[PDB]
Symmetry: none
Subunit: 90 residues, 2 copies
């Protein structure tokens, strides 16, 4: 895969299937400072990607009415967007 | 045929839009690729902001998390509400 989304979706999918399998057989290690941080930087980036494309969509959607450089710049500046992001939206 | 119509609707509207843009010059107008460039630029900035607070919510939400399965369970469907304003 490539996109950050796909990879995080993939990695998490394997960690879940990896748990079930350990559940089938007590093999839950404590997180390491690096491990945790690594998981946080990834998840953030994946969720960031979802945030990116939703944002572009909405913006592109709400700026459509503008027809002038002034109007376009005016509309964008006044834009405030509420965005929902989920690990299950990858 | 619904798609074929849109395809025609697009061309039809593109013909109208242009003329409408022209009459407007007779009394500054944004060009196609021009808008695309400001929008992609503006959008990326807002993205970078959404990206900044998301890392903040995830890291914070990774608090009680001390084992790898606990964080796997937690990150399975974690959701965040995020607000981004050009004013930032």
């Amino acid at each position: 895969d490539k996109t950050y989304e796909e990879m995080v979706k993939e990695v998490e999918r394997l960690k879940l299937e990896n748990k079930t399998l350990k559940q089938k057989v007590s093999d839950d290690s404590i997180l390491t400072a690096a491990k945790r941080e690594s998981i946080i930087v990834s998840s953030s980036r994946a969720l960031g990607a979802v945030a990116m494309r939703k944002i572009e969509a909405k913006v592109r959607s709400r700026a459509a009415k503008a027809v002038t450089e002034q109007e376009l710049t005016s509309l964008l500046q006044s834009l405030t967007l509420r965005v929902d992001v989920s690990m299950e939206e990858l």
